[PDB]
């Protein structure tokens, strides 16, 4: 297994099911609205 695998759980001619497992670094921020 891996921290960033790309597994296949089903596949057809035009479509497939991809199981993505990934580690992420979510960097978010706040926005303040000021009305005076």
């Amino acid at each position: 297994a891996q921290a960033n695998e790309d597994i296949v759980v089903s596949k057809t001619s035009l479509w497939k099911e991809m199981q993505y497992n990934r580690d992420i670094t979510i960097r978010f921020k706040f926005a303040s609205s000021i009305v005076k």
């Binding site: 759980v9 035009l14 099911e17 993505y20 497992n21 990934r22 580690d23 992420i24 921020k29 303040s32």
Partner: protein
């Protein structure tokens, strides 16, 4: 979309030189506290129904002209 519940910590927001203090929560005045970002480590596992060929592309960019009345 990651959803977060909230638990107020020891620091208390208050307006100095004003009659408001000892109030718990997080105001909208300066939530970032001068930080360029808040960083949280996550991991996600999901199963997505995707076209078999890894060459298709859903549109990503946009040209937005909404709220013309506004």
């Amino acid at each position: 979309r990651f959803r977060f519940r909230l638990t107020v910590e020891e620091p208390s927001f208050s307006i100095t030189r004003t009659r408001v203090s000892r109030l718990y929560g997080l105001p909208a005045a300066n939530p970032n506290n001068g930080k360029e970002y808040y960083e949280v480590a996550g991991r996600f596992s999901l199963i997505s129904l995707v076209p078999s060929n890894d060459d298709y592309q859903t549109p990503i960019t946009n040209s937005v002209t909404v709220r013309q009345d506004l």
